Curated annotation (Swiss-Prot), chain B:
Gene designation per UniProt: PAXX
Organism: Homo sapiens (Human)
Function statement: Non-essential DNA repair protein involved in DNA non-homologous end joining (NHEJ); participates in double-strand break (DSB) repair and V(D)J recombination. May act as a scaffold required for accumulation of the Ku heterodimer, composed of XRCC5/Ku80 and XRCC6/Ku70, at double-strand break sites and promote the assembly and/or stability of the NHEJ machinery. Involved in NHEJ by promoting the ligation of blunt-ended DNA ends. Together with NHEJ1/XLF, collaborates with DNA polymerase lambda (POLL) to promote joining of non-cohesive DNA ends.
Keywords from the UniProt entry: Chromosome, Cytoplasm, DNA damage, DNA repair, Nucleus, Phosphoprotein
Subunit structure: Homodimer. Interacts with the DNA-bound XRCC5/Ku80 and XRCC6/Ku70 heterodimer (Ku complex); the interaction is direct. Associated component of the non-homologous end joining (NHEJ) complex, composed of the core proteins PRKDC, LIG4, XRCC4, XRCC6/Ku70, XRCC5/Ku86 and NHEJ1/XLF. Interacts with POLL (DNA polymerase lambda); promoting POLL recruitment to double-strand breaks (DSBs) and stimulation of the end-filling activity of POLL.
Family: Belongs to the XRCC4-XLF family. PAXX subfamily.
Notes on the domains: The N-terminus (residues 1-113) forms a head domain that is structurally related to those of XRCC4, XLF/NHEJ1, and SASS6.
Name under which the protein is recorded: Protein PAXX
Amino acid sequence: SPPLCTLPPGPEPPRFVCYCEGEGFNLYVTDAAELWSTCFTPDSLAALKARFGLEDITPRFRAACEQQAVALTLQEDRASLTLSGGPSALAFDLSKVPGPEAAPRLRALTLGLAKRVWSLERRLAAA
Amino acid sequence: SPPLCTLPPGPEPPRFVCYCEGEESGEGDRGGFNLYVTDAAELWSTCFTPDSLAALKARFGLSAAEDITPRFRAACEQQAVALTLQEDRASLTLSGGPSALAFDLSKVPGPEAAPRLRALTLGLAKRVWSLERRLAAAEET
């Protein structure tokens, strides 16, 4: 079940969602209008893991999402995502995704979320 | 929690979300009822006025103080929502209940639609996160 969290974590309205896909594996951040991505290649992902000392990034990100231990700085076309909890905080550089590439992802994101909600409410009612 | 469903039903990737708004409980701000349909590119709405909602309710024999949200909710749970899309217009048919209810929807203008779609996306993600937390609890622990 694909991990995600929203920011800010307060009772205030959510402004950003952080999620990941498919260990083409990447981290994403969106305010539902623009999309930022780690834009990994198979090579630069391996480079990244080795620098931090790795297995898989997803479980750490999942754990951060549950603890709401995700920090986000955003400037211009630049964002960073920080995961806290592990033996070392992990920071990721993200870049803005051009509109034409971002649009189908944002579209599928919205439709998939809606389908999850419907499914989770279905399952939660049977509990 | 606010009702919704996705279409088409079953295992195939969702193409549309249907949801509703208004008829809020309590003595606080209460908005008029509307049904929404989106493919996450465009937004369609019933765009009800007080008169057009009354006329719709008459067309299918409902009273004025009657909330329509619970009929929508039943339709969503059973996935008895049928959608037709013309170029400009849409229809939504709810068959959760004993009598079918048909709704005319029209396109919401971009400057109103775009902030509604963003809030929808962000709100759903908050829900998902909240639901999976409540689920992990109930099912095992």
